[PDB]
Design a protein around this ligand. Sequence first.
Ligand SMILES: CC(C)=CCC/C(C)=C\CSP(=O)(O)OP(=O)(O)O
Ligand SMILES: [Mg+2]
Length: 289
Amino acid sequence: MNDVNRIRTDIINVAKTFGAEYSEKVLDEVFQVFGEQFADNSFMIRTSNKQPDKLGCYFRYHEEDESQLGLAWDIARKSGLLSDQGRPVDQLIPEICETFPIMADGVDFDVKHGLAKIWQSIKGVVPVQDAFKLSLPASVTTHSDFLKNHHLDALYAFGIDYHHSSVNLYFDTYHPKHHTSEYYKNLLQDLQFQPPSDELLELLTNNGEIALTFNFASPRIERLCFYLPFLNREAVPQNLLNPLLKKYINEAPALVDNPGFILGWSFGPQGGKGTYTKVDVDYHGRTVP
Ligand SMILES: CC(C)=CCC/C(C)=C\CSP(=O)(O)OP(=O)(O)O
Ligand SMILES: [Mg+2]
């Protein structure tokens, strides 16, 4: 119903409040094809401090209704919101669906630039080596031993970023080392990424998902991401947050009195790009639990 319009209104108010580059011409075209999937599925609105003074704004949804799997890529292609510009990421979603059983779908949207990402989550966990036969970046295969050595072993999902022509591999935290802070300090050190704070190293002991980004332009792992859920606003560690992101924890729209959040900590090479914070609000309240 109006549920689509509440959502669209909320995104626009979020961008305007937090200084995110946005286009309504682009938001309209997205909502024409997808607005109903935002009302009917697990749905989150994200901001990130990729720049210190201005948050960018994204909105995402996951489809887990089995009968609807693949519909998102079909309607993104058919609608024209995702074109096939020949780039190496353009074949990845078709390759994934032939190789693995798919259990959930998702697409990510940039509020200025439109459709940014497509997700596929495997039916179950697979050894990351099973992915090596895809046209993934060469940096996945060349890092097979690193992956094994840090138990980034258990692949469960893909993100295909058509904006940055990169690939996120998502790993389940199966190993007892994945619940010790020392592991995350040593992983980040082995990558020569920005070391994390002590507050975050303690929180990371409860960590749930680890993601790594590969791109076709680089022989290097580009960045990694840790993710943690938080049951409501006040559960979120205020001290690890940009005053703009503290604000977002307090004002972010939801269709529920006190929504949960997923936070993401992206780390990149020390002294470079890729080390910032992502804040997703559980807009229906039915995703973090
Ligand atoms: C829509 C759902 C269920 C989850 C989306 C948010 C989440 C916790 C993880 C995947 S989004 P992410 O990999 O963090 O995107 P990038 O930072 O790689 O651009
Ligand atoms: Mg659904």
